[PDB]
Design an enzyme around this catalytic site. Sequence first.
Site, PDB file in Angstrom:
ATOM      1  N   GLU A 197       0.826  -1.196   0.000  1.00 35.93           N
ATOM      2  CA  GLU A 197       0.000   0.000   0.000  1.00 35.93           C
ATOM      3  C   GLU A 197       0.866   1.253   0.000  1.00 35.93           C
ATOM      4  O   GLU A 197       0.473   2.268  -0.581  1.00 35.93           O
ATOM      5  CB  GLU A 197      -0.964  -0.013   1.190  1.00 35.93           C
ATOM      6  N   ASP A 243       0.306   4.038  -3.645  1.00 35.25           N
ATOM      7  CA  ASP A 243       0.998   5.304  -3.403  1.00 35.25           C
ATOM      8  C   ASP A 243       2.354   5.105  -2.739  1.00 35.25           C
ATOM      9  O   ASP A 243       2.476   4.374  -1.757  1.00 35.25           O
ATOM     10  CB  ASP A 243       0.125   6.212  -2.533  1.00 35.25           C
ATOM     11  N   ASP A 287       2.204   7.864   1.056  1.00 37.35           N
ATOM     12  CA  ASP A 287       0.906   8.476   1.326  1.00 37.35           C
ATOM     13  C   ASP A 287       1.038   9.323   2.587  1.00 37.35           C
ATOM     14  O   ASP A 287       0.758   8.892   3.705  1.00 37.35           O
ATOM     15  CB  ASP A 287      -0.173   7.412   1.460  1.00 37.35           C
TER      16      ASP A 287
END
EC number: 3.2.1.-
Lengths: 663, 663, 663
Positions: free
Chosen positions: B356, B389, B392
Amino acid sequence: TANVVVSNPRPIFTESRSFKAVANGKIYIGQIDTDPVNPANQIPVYIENEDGSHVQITQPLIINAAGKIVYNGQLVKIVTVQGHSMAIYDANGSQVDYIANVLKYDPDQYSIEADKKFKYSVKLSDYPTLQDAASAAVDGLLIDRDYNFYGGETVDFGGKVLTIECKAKFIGDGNLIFTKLGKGSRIAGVFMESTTTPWVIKPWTDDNQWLTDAAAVVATLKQSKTDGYQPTVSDYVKFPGIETLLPPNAKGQNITSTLEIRECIGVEVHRASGLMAGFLFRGCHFCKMVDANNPSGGKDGIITFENLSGDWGKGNYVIGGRTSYGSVSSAQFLRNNGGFERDGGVIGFTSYRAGESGVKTWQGTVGSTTSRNYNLQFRDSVVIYPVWDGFDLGADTDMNPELDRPGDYPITQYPLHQLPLNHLIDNLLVRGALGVGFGMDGKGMYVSNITVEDCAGSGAYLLTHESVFTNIAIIDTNTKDFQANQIYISGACRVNGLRLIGIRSTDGQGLTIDAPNSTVSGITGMVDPSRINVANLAEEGLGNIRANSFGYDSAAIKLRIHKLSKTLDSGALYSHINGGAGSGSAYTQLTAISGSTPDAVSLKVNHKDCRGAEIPFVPDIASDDFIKDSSCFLPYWENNSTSLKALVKKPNGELVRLTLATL
Amino acid sequence: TANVVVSNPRPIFTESRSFKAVANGKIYIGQIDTDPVNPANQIPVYIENEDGSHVQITQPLIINAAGKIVYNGQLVKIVTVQGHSMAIYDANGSQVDYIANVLKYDPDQYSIEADKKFKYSVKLSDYPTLQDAASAAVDGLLIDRDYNFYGGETVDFGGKVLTIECKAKFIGDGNLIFTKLGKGSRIAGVFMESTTTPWVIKPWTDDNQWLTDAAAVVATLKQSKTDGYQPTVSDYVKFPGIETLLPPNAKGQNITSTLEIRECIGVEVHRASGLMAGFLFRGCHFCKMVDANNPSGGKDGIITFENLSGDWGKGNYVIGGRTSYGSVSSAQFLRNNGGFERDGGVIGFTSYRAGESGVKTWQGTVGSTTSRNYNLQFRDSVVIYPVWDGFDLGADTDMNPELDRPGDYPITQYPLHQLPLNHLIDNLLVRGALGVGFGMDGKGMYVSNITVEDCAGSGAYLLTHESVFTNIAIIDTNTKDFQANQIYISGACRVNGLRLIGIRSTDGQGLTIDAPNSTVSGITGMVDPSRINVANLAEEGLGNIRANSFGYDSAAIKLRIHKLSKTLDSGALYSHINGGAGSGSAYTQLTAISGSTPDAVSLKVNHKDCRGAEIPFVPDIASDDFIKDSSCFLPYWENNSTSLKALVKKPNGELVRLTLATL
Amino acid sequence: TANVVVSNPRPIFTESRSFKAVANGKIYIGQIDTDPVNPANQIPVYIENEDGSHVQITQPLIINAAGKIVYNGQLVKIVTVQGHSMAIYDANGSQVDYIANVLKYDPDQYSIEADKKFKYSVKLSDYPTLQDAASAAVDGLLIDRDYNFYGGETVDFGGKVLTIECKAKFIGDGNLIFTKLGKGSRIAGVFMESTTTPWVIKPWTDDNQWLTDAAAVVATLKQSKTDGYQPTVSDYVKFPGIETLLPPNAKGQNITSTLEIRECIGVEVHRASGLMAGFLFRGCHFCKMVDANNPSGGKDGIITFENLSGDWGKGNYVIGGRTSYGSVSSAQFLRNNGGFERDGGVIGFTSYRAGESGVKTWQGTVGSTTSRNYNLQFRDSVVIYPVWDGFDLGADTDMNPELDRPGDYPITQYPLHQLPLNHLIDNLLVRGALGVGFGMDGKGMYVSNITVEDCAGSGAYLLTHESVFTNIAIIDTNTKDFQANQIYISGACRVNGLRLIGIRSTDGQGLTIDAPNSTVSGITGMVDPSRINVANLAEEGLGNIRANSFGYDSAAIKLRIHKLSKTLDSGALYSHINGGAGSGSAYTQLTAISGSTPDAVSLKVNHKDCRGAEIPFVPDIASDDFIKDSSCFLPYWENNSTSLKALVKKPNGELVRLTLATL
């Protein structure tokens, strides 16, 4: 703690079959598990006299009528190596006794393997003072009782080198000396507090932007161990009036608990901690601290290398780490010469609220000798919210007006602010500084990749000469507007790569970059040439150029001479749309300044889609001195006859008055 | 095994020259090499009772008739504190003996010396459960053997600060809880492995790049521990349609082993590795994780600092180390306020297949408490191949949470995606990102030296406003052109200096910079103005411009009105060589646009080596509106007279028609 | 030179009231703190023979007339496994003496308790060699004495995982083999050197400049280990004339004290050091080198990561630390693959005068298999003052013999050194190199933020094609003109940036940049058109431009074609000052070249404030081919009529001779 027993000395040898001393007995001492009667298996035996001399004697030792070893009828003390095999014979050759290994007769036979199976260390909890624990140590030390001390306790480490490990608190005010600790130690996990609670000022807001009035600093003054530092001499210069407003008790405080390592070589300190603490290495060679974790500062610099006494030092580093608060420079280097090796310097440091500098390479003659730093290396270091230059890398900032400098090259050899310090600077960052951000002066080094931002004071106060800079980024600096520009520079430099223009545009003098004595290229921004002073701005490497004019109805390109005027260009070049936007056509105006006013003289190309270039003329009769280029004609007018005429300079060079047009 | 030898502990004193005991004699022990009769030279003497009482006695020790020291009629064992000189006096008063230096160590009571002399540490080979070793530990704790565990090992360290060294497995599925740790504890070398081999996917092609299908994604499913990771909730949104295909035990997988630390101060973990392992600090302050030995991630994040409950996260670091794989973000920080000190975040890191993010602060509200973070720094971080991303760093999502965000700046004070994070970002690096390699939202950040190269995903999604941005280097991102925008800032920030375009990637030629709302400067590269959409592209701090043409017979400098036409230029200046090259003669044309076509209208100087000024005129009779400049004449042609006339706008403001040329 | 005294070990038992032995007496041995006369309390007793054999014996021990214990007439030594209480009785049954605790502790329980409580470690002083110590080690091995080893001696470990806190010096001549280390084994504080000091050459002087004359090099020949380096084979080629000036002894010898580990996994070496050191790692995975203590180097590689024995290497890093003088490349890499993690990195390393390179990769087949290295990483690492190339990251290789590689891919298929490997490079520096600041060949590489600065050799020498480099800086290199240039690319690359010229570029001599087939972009600095020579340089991504003058009477927007000229002008817009400077009025001339000389043909606007565009005319008859644009006119001078006429091309495109200006 009695450890030595009052046993019988001068040991007694007794026969194996009667309670009689072995008179005129022969004793042989030899190698372990060997027969000592053979001379090749024997080991040396020494007598020990009144004066400590060890004298080797012949091997069959004589037992007298009492049962003890005599040399010439006089009792002695025979001493040999730890392990041996002893054999006692009588005078008639009968074997009285044979011990194959004397060491195997000690009552506690677990002691041997217990010693050679485990790891040595000693704990402070079992000893009254730290000197006893240091003396008893062989391999490591464990600090587990919080130790109180004062100013003056020295502890010696006997030349033996250890792995000091700390797991508790040290409290008390003063200085704690570590002496004669050998090559290659480790000191991990120190904690350092003080007894009394001094008064520290609070010179920033609840929104953390700096507060500049001395009265509110005095208002926010409070006694604590965190959230402030005691004011220093340079804060008086930084904050005028604050000397008088602050009550006298909180002035010039010296409440410091510090640990000083006095002339130790190769001691490594790991994970240093402790609020309002002090850590200083005196005369230390190849001694560094390695990721010290968030200690708050007091009076003394939290990271200090002091090399003034004795020989020049080399090898002192600050690898990583982060430090908080401190009334003076958190990391101060004193008289360090990196040599050709390029030794000394800082790695990966983080500094916060340093009283002077995140790193202070001390400048000028400090004390009875010099304090300059040579061949050091500084990379990946960050200073946030200091009071002065976070990387104060200069050596001759203001002092030494005399032509000479003690223990160093004179000004007559190399001039002031212009020295071969030869440091290595890269990837350094300053953020949120109150005063100046980066101060540095010398000759012949090369500095690169600075990043200074959000500076209340001037983010760059450079004072060097003949120094090359690359990929520099001083952005959003001088935001409170102390100074009329972001960056000061005194001597000549050659910058290759810079960016400017920030969210808060400078308004002190309408001058962003002021290096009129220096040569700068690569300036980035829409900043006006009137707000730029250089000695050379020649980006002479550019290739095929195309200009984007976004958000402007006309495309603009300006050619400027600053000898004529500053805010005005010698010429401008605009392109304007022929008609409304989206016309698909645009005439090109090229103008120049005449009479202190641009756009007074201009030529137009395809004026409103005319397929022709405009040709102006003199409003009066064209003068012979107006045009001086041969084989050219200058048009002019005569309002009396209302027609064009030409003042023609032939390729020969003579002036003729011809008639361009007739009515 | 021999362990204790039978020996007589009572010393026996005898005469110097005969084998008879010193009957009723006296013994004085004193300092080394001194006469012990003087009370000044005498050192203390202690009776050592059968339990270790150590009761002091007066100096002259009395000898029995058997040669043994006695006190109150009983035999005693006398111990002193250092080496001594012995003086033995006969009952008459005659000197039996004097020895200057004698020292024999007490051969008993070794237990006390062993407890004072060694280092304490407990091993798991001597205890059945971890809790027993936790209860028995005082200084250290060594995992020497391979420990099974169940989900929910609750282990209490009772507040003792320890150093938990590790040398073996922590195998099992679930959580291990270490509770009640003192400040400054350490964990090092801990390595874990889940008991069950999970179902992991292969979302990349072994000869570079990712998979963008669903058929091969399911065709590359294997039960393994490495070279593949677990599916998550948000993998179907990057590989459309897996949800009905995976094994039911694979979906909602619990296959993870975690290191869970709960509410303790200052506990560091060092060089921690693990297959399907993750380390999650819960409610822990001032902790870090110094490097790592490449742990393989599991369902939860690898590095997980979480602080929703109680106070915010402070002092929470990630220093060094690299991580492999992981379903969720590699480094996540929840509810971390670094204070004014700005203590928290990543200083150096390396990520691979960070499912993530390389680093992600989760955004908005989780449970009943906000997840926003303050004062988080990010230096020296390298991430490669993040599925999502790259970093993030935002705090607010697109979907609007509850208004007036609790514990933060309310929506009345500060709107959505408009928060002061006060973060520090510098020296970043991205390669191979299928996700948006950089994304953050806020108000007034100062981002520096990010660099994003060679990514299948979009380069940047910057959702802040009026911030500062620097040297983004976008290098062939979006290899096969997924979305439209590569770099896109939603605010009025200043992106001072950039670089775009690798070998070939814009989106397919078609507008990377979707940033028509920010005042950008310093852009360079091989990006077309039709593909540039910025508010104000003006780099006007420039100087004497050089235009070197390579591969061009001519030389070009353009100035464009883009609202006229994105692909067409308003005006230009060209240097064109007449005839062939190598002449040393090239003419200069100043050119405009008319009717959406370049080089239709121009002035030329030395055109075809003519040495004069080539200027066109109106083909038909010019009108009075095409010429609008006074004291200037526009030429035009009359086909009826086959001649030239001139419309001469006088400086008085009137127009006159004059015969410009006629034979 | 002796520590223990010559004492009688054999116990003699005497009466407690008179000086007579306990003749034919009894010794009873029992449990701790009880009465041993009871048969129930009695513990086993064993005779310990000379050779070590034990014989369990009946309990009531006989004391003969001499006061010594005898069993079969001969004297014996009684031992027990546990602590005991002793009761000595006389022949008549009267109790002579009682003791309840011979050692005041029982070591049979205490052995278990101390095994459970303390930390395990063995010391080198307790054992003669290292192999027996390694076999007897369990967890730790403390090296507290200097160990003399010889080359090729092997020490096994049996697979035990240990930490070796290398603690004193460790000396010997050659390679020492370590084997059979488990995962997580650690070496710390280690230190190599050898007995024989070598002949070392010293080719650098105080002036921070290197000696290039061979006699100058030989005239600096020392007998030392530091401040110098051992001549090798490559210095023959590097130093012209050195092949015969050195004595025969000064070449052909190999001294290297190396601690070489062999077929190990996961072994770290922290805080390494050593004068003339060497560390060869063979067959290693997951290993590291955490920090360093600047170990000076020797003849062989000083960090030689090899993987010749077995499969290809994976994950062998060098984190932090620094290094000093050496005779060959500081870091070698032999046969290691990075997989997809790009595994194998050097980070934060500051090497210094390595004999060949701070980092380099090998090639061909060396030893038993091929020796190439793909998929590595090199971040933040720095090599100052090398001899050969600064970094040899060249993995597609430059073998001067036949280009095809053994057991690998061709080069006739794969263009001049083509292989997509994607090594990661960021923040690298070189200063003072005699070789080059950069060497690496690859396709598809992405290289960023390099700052090669102030080297005696050239700034860079590339060997790539189609690989992208960004923010590249080379400053003031190549003072001796090592190459013909400063930055070279030997292929078709894209170089997104170059920041050149600090003080010098060659000697000012030509050919500054080379790029025969490579496109460069975005360059800035004092570089000149005569210095630049690339395949392409187009910078189309920028915006509005401005020409700024300082100290000049001129502002020049200047366009030069290098097909036409190198230093002359092709066309320009010059702007000068009307009359004296500071008048507020300035004129502008659009100039072209006519006759290989500037400003021969121009238009002048506001010449002497005339507000008019000067129109030069042809001094002779304007020919038909002189003007060709339709609807245009070209003026000319007629000497026969001394009049200004005009050749006018109609908008239809036909020529006519008319009279422009004539009285």
